[PDB]
Amino acid sequence: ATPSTIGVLALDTVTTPFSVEITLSIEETARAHGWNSFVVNMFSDDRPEAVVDLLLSHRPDGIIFTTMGLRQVPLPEKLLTLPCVLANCESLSQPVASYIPDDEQGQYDAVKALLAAGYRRPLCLHLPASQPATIRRRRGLERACREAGIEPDHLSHSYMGQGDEHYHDIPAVVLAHIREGKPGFDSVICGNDRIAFMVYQTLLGQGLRIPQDVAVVGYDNMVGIGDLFLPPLSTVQLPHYDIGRLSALHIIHGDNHRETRKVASPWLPRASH
Amino acid sequence: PSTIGVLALDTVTTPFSVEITLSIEETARAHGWNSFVVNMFSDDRPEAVVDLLLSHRPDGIIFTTMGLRQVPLPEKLLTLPCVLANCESLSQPVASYIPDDEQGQYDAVKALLAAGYRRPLCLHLPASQPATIRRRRGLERACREAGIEPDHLSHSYMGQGDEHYHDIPAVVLAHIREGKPGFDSVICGNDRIAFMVYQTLLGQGLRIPQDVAVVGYDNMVGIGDLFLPPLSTVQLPHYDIGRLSALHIIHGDNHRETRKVASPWLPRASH
């Protein structure tokens, strides 16, 4: 008789090994309750029905489907009947318990802090439009601007194209809003810290100072950087750790609800504003 | 079916080297084997964690560190691992697969000097970290083969802890007199040091690489191609390390040698 076990299916840890804080959080939470936990990673060359059968081989008591990058889970509808809970992803067809970041609250607290600090004309650089978080973050940004008496439709907005090759388009977008060395914005709201990286390199290389000449705000607090920005980047923490914890407890305490719970995305003010 | 038990000692503090455990899991399935991973956190303790992976009763065991270290665990706990990935055993001799830090730094510095640079500022990682001294042998050999005595160059060692990455800007500006730098290039211990270097040089009004070439190390999956211009670096072979470690168990090897895995030079546009 082995202890209770949580089976986890990671759909894309291969292309984005940053959200590993989700699977680590699950493993740590399960151990703090006398449970075990294994993780099956889905690569590109293998295929779903095989991978799902493999995690069923360990015969788990509960199952968690997770995406390292907030997505909508592109798997057969017949394979979305096994997962007791979804971590950082939502099911379009069947309704399943889901724990996702509160993208609208995160972007709102960030933009609210920026405007409150005195900025009024931010350049807004959004992530790909179809990504599920992009539209929720923009609602937060818009709500913060309207509460400050600013119509967000009057600001400069830009959407990135899908793929890391597009991070190199950011510099051209920033320089396009700079006329004869003086910028047509007093701040820059970045879809993520990788966009902030591009922004820092472009502004410093243009002879501008952060934040004396231009404030900057990122999103994610990427475990790989965040504190490496000069100056330290004001950003928003993606709650990968709380997402994994809440997902594990849902199974540990055998919950039956199938609601989509939005986890708090805390604002990390630093020195970029 | 046969199963490989993996013990990750520090994926909590450095979740970048996850490419090792992923590579192990992928290689084991390509041979009809299974594989589980036990992560050691800070709040738990070894004897408990080691007993836990023995619970799954594995056919082979791999001890791995996300950051090349010398494995700070009881000598009696280093008798179970069939192979060590990205780490070495000081006491008992155990089969180990580690990066060829000397070859990696050599190919990098060789390419830099060959491109025409002669006075690089060398920013090394903490001295006690086992790779730091091996990378410096590579750097020195490249410089001596180019007729340069590395003892005449400016060297600096970082202090242990991420808090010290913020000391890099001061070290770079200390080698700049009245706006003109006293170096024509910068050899960085890793891409995180390169990040600090880029921010400091661009903020100083210097151009990369027209005024100062820059070279990193690791090719951090999280950046590398995000540098402006794209950072010339060295790839840490986490993927090959995991693969070779899995095969050692799959094919039941008996040697207890320390194999150095190739660390390939990724030239880009920072030089």
From TrEMBL, chain B:
<keyword id="KW-0804">Transcription</keyword>
<keyword id="KW-0805">Transcription regulation</keyword>
<dbReference type="GO" id="GO:0000976">
    <property type="term" value="F:transcription cis-regulatory region binding"/>
</dbReference>
<protein>
    <submittedName>
        <fullName>Transcriptional regulator</fullName>
    </submittedName>
</protein>
<keyword id="KW-0678">Repressor</keyword>
<dbReference type="GO" id="GO:0003700">
    <property type="term" value="F:DNA-binding transcription factor activity"/>
</dbReference>
<keyword id="KW-0238">DNA-binding</keyword>
